[PDB]
Amino acid sequence: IDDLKPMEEQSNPSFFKMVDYYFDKGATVIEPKLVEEMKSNSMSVMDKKNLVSGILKAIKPVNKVLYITFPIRRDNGEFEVVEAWRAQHSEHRTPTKGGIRYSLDVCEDEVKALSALMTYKCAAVDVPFGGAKGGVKIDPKMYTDYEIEKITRRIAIEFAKKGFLGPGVDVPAPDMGTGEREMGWIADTYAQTIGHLDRDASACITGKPIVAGGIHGRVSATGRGVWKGLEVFAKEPEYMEKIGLTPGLPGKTVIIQGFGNVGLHTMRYLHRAGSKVVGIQEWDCAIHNPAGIHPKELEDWRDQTGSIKNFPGAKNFEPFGDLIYEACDILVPAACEKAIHKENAGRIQAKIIAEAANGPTTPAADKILLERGNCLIIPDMYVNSGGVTVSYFEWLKNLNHVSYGRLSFKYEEDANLMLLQSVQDSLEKAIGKEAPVRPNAQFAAKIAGASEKDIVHSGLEYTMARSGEAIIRTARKYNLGLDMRTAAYANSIEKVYNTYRTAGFTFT
Amino acid sequence: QVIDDLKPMEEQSNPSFFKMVDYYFDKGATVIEPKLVEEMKSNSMSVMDKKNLVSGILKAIKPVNKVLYITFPIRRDNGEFEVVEAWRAQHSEHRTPTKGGIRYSLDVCEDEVKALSALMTYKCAAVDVPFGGAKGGVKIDPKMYTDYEIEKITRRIAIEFAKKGFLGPGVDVPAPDMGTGEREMGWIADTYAQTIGHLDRDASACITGKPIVAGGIHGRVSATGRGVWKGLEVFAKEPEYMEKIGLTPGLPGKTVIIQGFGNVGLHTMRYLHRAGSKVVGIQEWDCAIHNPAGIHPKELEDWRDQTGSIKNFPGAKNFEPFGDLIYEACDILVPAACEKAIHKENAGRIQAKIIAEAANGPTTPAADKILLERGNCLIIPDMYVNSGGVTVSYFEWLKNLNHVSYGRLSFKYEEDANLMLLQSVQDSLEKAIGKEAPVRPNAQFAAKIAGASEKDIVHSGLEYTMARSGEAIIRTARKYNLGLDMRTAAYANSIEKVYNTYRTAGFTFT
């Protein structure tokens, strides 16, 4: 039907195929440099082109999909068969990394598309994992705690038996329908059965509860990275003027589509950065307030009343699905894929679109806005990878068998106080009077609060900034304009390809 | 088109293979369930409780447990690269390793490997082979690749399958199938032994169908054919069914039409021609030949070997409407080609009194029903009668675990014991009758003694299993008054064995 039109003309394209289209755009930018960098005096130019083309060809398709079925007895005593999948898109680095969904939506093509995006996300943030994705095809709200635990423990055993769960092979994480209690159950099941000799059993999964080896700073990480991603680009006048904006995040109006975890923490960090979140669009409501909604009050009001609607500090915006077409400086899509498509891209008045969700903009809509010349799209596989980065830190913490800062916080504090007293001694000698030299209020507060989350945050921010700058240099180098998505894919593909070339692949 | 896939299974023209097997499974499940409940010893469960547990176990057995799908690049011989897809299904892990062949074919799909992996579970159970069923495929046409490229593909699937637990002597043991043979089998064993399994004492037990030098077993090549013969033998000796279908007992003199002259059809025709049957027809994919006086298997194979086909075989006539030879009158029809060869639209034209399903799923449920109601056709079901190879593959796996070939430490010992016994009889006979009285192996025994070898142990084991399984099918069909529905008797026997594994391993809670 539609799926014969070109990809930049499709209305309801496949998710995996639109990711492959973004891959191809990126491979095209980078392949000349790759052929040029290959050096053999025993390879002809055709040899070199074929090898580069062959590695890029290998990267695109999912390496591996495990499909399983198993029985369970429901709490009522009857028996039912459950399906589950785990895709490992790329093993150029192991373990693979990616979440597990409990949803009726899960399908093989879905885990394939998102596992591929996971490969490019990890590469974007210099996280040494190939991408993976899993799903159990259940509506979890239809099951008791005990039924969910039985299902969770059974996928842990079956996945682990076949090499689809393990600290060195495949490390999952929460997704839609799962959370930290399921990760704690998977970790325990692994540690207690087929990983009972694994010294690093708790590194088999991330998003664990703190008491089971989880990491502080996980819950807000994705939202905090979206903020840092927006920050990296908002400081650039070249792109800010071409889209008609002034630099910096303070003052910018933000419409956020989705008040789940990522939208909420983005709102939190954006609000906490001086922005006005003038609109919240949800699946059945939308509140707007040109003054901006306060995320605490609205989270509380949503907590209290169950919904953002009628939010005392916010009018209900009706035609509530059209709040995203309202005028804003930044639109933050944080709900499902293909939210900006062929048929609505032109109605988007946002000057920046920060893709907090996976695949919110179809190739068709990406084109319309790029040709329009006044829209900066910050791509999903960069801007929404803050959680990926922190998950790497959680895996490391489990391999380390100690929390970050345990052996350094006091040592460093005492060293800093000794340094400050040395300066005070030196100053009082030079000026001949009492002159205290103490931490100011900010430094005193960070010293008093020093905790693992600070180390996580600093590490996240360091990575988001470096990755963002590399995407900018690439766009500039190839005169890609506001097409930061093609720049980001070129950078990620290049890293994957160079893994293959130094490993020396071919041997199949 | 698919209006068919809506009719009851027994009305369908082109049912799915996996749907056929599940319908056949349900027929066996239905017969056997009351006994299964009985077999559940538990003072803590009511009979209601036990009926529920049994139905949960049967619900678990039917669907394929696991499927691994992989893609990987290969460098063609000229230097450009191509991505290749492969699958491995493990239908049941109630016993491990799983067992099943690997196809190199363009026809391999996830659903065919699934349908045939389930069949494998029931085949292995039919012949008391302690493996769950498995099936694999690489989606290539192998004749479009050089030997070098086939070896690279073969070694890569060995590595990727073994890393994920889809190749190994205790987890999953493959075998040849369409598009593969013993050289690929030897390449997989060597790759396994040299990489993922380099600390495996029993690395060569990772796969069967191996060349002899790599640990293959004598008697593998004709084993499926020899089992088809012995399965037909067990039933031809029963007058209750030979009469009902209008036949005399015994294979000697019976007329045979074989559909397909691949490995299975050729070795069936050799064993049936020996033993005294008359193979009057051979139907292949483009020809048929016929000779109402019987076709000699060795002359035919030679002629095909020299010319490339059975066409114009001097010892027969070409039969035209060549795709219609299987409707000609014969005592035994041996379908030995593709699945669903007998279906709703042609079943009535079968004149064979006995159909021996050498192929997998040659008779659709629609046709199976059409021929059962006629009352004059005995179908010997695939998952029993074509399981001679599975049996011998179990023996090949055991030989690799044993690290010695069968008879190496017994042939001479038993020969010398047998000579001493015969010499003892001779001494006793000469003393009692007072004259010279030689007591020696007769010509048959002396021939068996001189040629004693691993193939003989394999053959005797194969025959022993085929006979016991065939007799257990007949006993089950008698007990449940199934008549000539031997298929439903076979699935009932297969299901019961799988179920009893679950019952003793325990499924009460999980």
Does an H or E element contain A84, and which?
A: strand A79-88
Cβ–Cβ < 8 Å for B239, B232: no
Say if the Cβ atoms of B69 and A69 lie within 8 Å.
no
What positions of B carry a catalytic annotation? 135
Cβ–Cβ < 8 Å for A500, A55: yes
Cβ–Cβ < 8 Å for B93, B505: no
Say if the Cβ atoms of B67 and A67 lie within 8 Å.
yes
Amino acid at the residue B99:
K
Count the Cβ atoms, other than its own, within 10 Å of residue B79.
Answer: 16
Which DSSP string corresponds to A19-49? HHHHHHHHHHHHHHHHHHH---SS--HHHHH
Q: Is residue A429 part of a domain?
A: no
Q: Say if residue B101 is in the same domain as residue B183.
A: yes
Which DSSP string corresponds to B397-461? HHHHHHTS-TTTTTHHHHHHHHHHHHHHHHHHHHHHHSS-------HHHHHHHHT--HHHHHHHH
Cβ–Cβ < 8 Å for A395, A167: yes
Which chain A positions have a beta carbon within 8 Å of B82's beta carbon? 54, 57
Distance, in Å, from the CA atom of B410 to the CA atom of B449, rounded to the nearest integer, reads 12
Q: Say if residue B321 is in the same domain as residue B375.
A: yes
Q: Say if residue B117 is in the same domain as residue B152.
A: yes
Q: Which two tokens stand for residue A444?
A: 């005193």
Q: Say if residue B208 is in the same domain as residue B263.
A: no
Distance, in Å, from the CA atom of B365 to the CA atom of B10, rounded to the nearest integer, reads 5
Q: Is residue A425 part of a domain?
A: no
Q: Pairing state of beta strands B132-138 and A130-136?
A: unpaired
Nearest to B34 by CA among B384, B509, B479: B479
Report the sign of the C-alpha dihedral through residues B15, B20, B22, B24, in that order.
positive
- Last residue in a domain, options B330, B360, B388: B388
Collapse the DSSP code of B4 into the 3-class scheme (helix H, G, I; strand E, B; otherwise coil) and give the result: helix
- Give the domain CATH number at B19: 1.10.287.140
Say if the Cβ atoms of A66 and B66 lie within 8 Å.
yes
For A472, residues 6+ apart whose C-beta sits below 8 A from its C-beta are: A232, A233, A236, A484, A487
Say if the Cβ atoms of B83 and A73 lie within 8 Å.
no
Q: Say if residue B142 is in the same domain as residue B286.
A: no
Residue A429 half-sphere exposure, CB side, CA atoms within 13 Å?
Answer: 6
* Strand ranges of the sheet holding A315-316, from the earlier edge strand across to the other edge: A315-316, A286-288, A276-281, A253-257, A330-333, A352-354, A376-378
Q: Say if residue A95 is in the same domain as residue A188.
A: yes
Cβ–Cβ < 8 Å for B354, B380: yes
Q: Say if residue A70 is in the same domain as residue A18.
A: no
Residue with tokens 């593969």: B180
Which domain covers residue B282, as residue numbers? 223-388
- Last residue in a domain, options B214, B234, B253: B214
Distance, in Å, from the CA atom of A77 to the CA atom of A81, rounded to the nearest integer, reads 13
Cβ–Cβ < 8 Å for A102, A136: yes
Q: What resolution (Å)? A: 1.9
Which chain B positions have a beta carbon within 8 Å of A163's beta carbon? 163-165
Cα distances (angstroms) measured from residue A136 to each of A7, A99, A119, A172, B378: 30, 11, 21, 13, 45
Q: Is residue A92 part of a domain?
A: yes
Q: Say if residue A344 is in the same domain as residue A469.
A: no
Distance, in Å, from the CA atom of A340 to the CA atom of A319, rounded to the nearest integer, reads 17
Collapse the DSSP code of A88 into the 3-class scheme (helix H, G, I; strand E, B; otherwise coil) and give the result: strand
Q: Pairing state of beta strands A352-354 and B81-90?
A: unpaired
Which chain A positions have a beta carbon within 8 Å of B83's beta carbon? 57-58, 61
Cβ–Cβ < 8 Å for B488, B27: yes
Nearest chain A Cα to B51, which residue? A78
Mutate to test the interface with A, among B66, B90, B148, B159 (most CBs of A within 10 A): B66
Distance, in Å, from the CA atom of B328 to the CA atom of B505, rounded to the nearest integer, reads 50
- Which residues on neighbouring strands pair with residue B281, listed in sequence order? B257, B290
Report the sign of the C-alpha dihedral through residues B109, B112, B118, B119, in that order.
negative
Q: What is the CA radius of gyration of chain A?
A: 24
Q: Is residue A354 part of a domain?
A: yes
Q: Is residue B453 part of a domain?
A: no
Amino acid at the residue A57:
K
Residue B224 marked in a binding site: yes
Q: Say if residue A484 is in the same domain as residue A380.
A: no
Amino acid at the residue B472:
A
Q: Is residue A436 part of a domain?
A: no
Distance, in Å, from the CA atom of A225 to the CA atom of A352, rounded to the nearest integer, reads 16
Q: Pairing state of beta strands A253-257 and A276-281?
A: parallel
Amino acid at the residue A197:
L
Q: Say if residue B210 is in the same domain as residue B227.
A: no
Q: Say if residue A378 is in the same domain as residue A246.
A: yes
Q: B316-323 — which CB contacts under 8 Å span 24+ positions? A: B316/B282, B316/B289, B316/B290, B316/B291, B317/B289, B317/B290, B317/B291, B318/B287, B318/B288, B318/B289, B319/B281, B319/B283, B319/B288, B319/B289, B319/B290, B320/B288, B322/B283, B322/B284, B322/B286, B322/B287, B322/B288, B323/B283, B323/B288
- Last residue in a domain, options B183, B214, B245: B214
Q: Is residue A411 part of a domain?
A: no
Intra-chain end-to-end CA distance of chain A, in Å:
38
Q: Say if residue A117 is in the same domain as residue A253.
A: no
Given the residues A25, A112, A133, A276, the one annotated as active site: A133
Q: Is residue B333 packed enough to be buried (19+ CB in 10 Å), middle (13-18) or exposed (0-12)? A: buried
Q: Where does residue B101 fall: left (phi above 0), alpha (psi -120 to 50 degrees), or beta otherwise? A: beta
User: How far is the alpha carbon of A51 from chain B, nearest alpha carbon, in Å?
Assistant: 7
Q: Pairing state of beta strands A253-257 and A330-333?
A: parallel
Which chain B positions have a beta carbon within 8 Å of A57's beta carbon? 73, 81-83
The number of domains in chain B is: 3
- Give the domain CATH number at B334: 3.40.50.720
Collapse the DSSP code of A73 into the 3-class scheme (helix H, G, I; strand E, B; otherwise coil) and give the result: strand
Q: Which two tokens stand for residue A79?
A: 């028996």
Q: Is residue A299 part of a domain?
A: yes
Cβ–Cβ < 8 Å for A134, A166: no
Collapse the DSSP code of A246 into the 3-class scheme (helix H, G, I; strand E, B; otherwise coil) and give the result: coil
Nearest chain A Cα to B63, which residue? A69
Nearest to A59 by CA among A507, A501, A396: A501
- Give the domain CATH number at A72: 3.40.50.10860
Q: Where does residue A499 fall: left (phi above 0), alpha (psi -120 to 50 degrees), or beta otherwise? A: alpha
* Strand ranges of the sheet holding B378-380, from the earlier edge strand across to the other edge: B317-318, B288-290, B278-283, B255-259, B332-335, B354-356, B378-380
Q: What is the dihedral of CA A143, A144, A147, A149, to 10 degrees?
A: 110
Distance, in Å, from the CA atom of A82 to the CA atom of B232, rounded to the nearest integer, reads 41
Nearest to B53 by CA among A71, A75, A79, A72: A79
Q: Pairing state of beta strands A100-102 and A130-136?
A: parallel
Residue with tokens 């439903």: B488
Distance, in Å, from the CA atom of A228 to the CA atom of A217, rounded to the nearest integer, reads 15
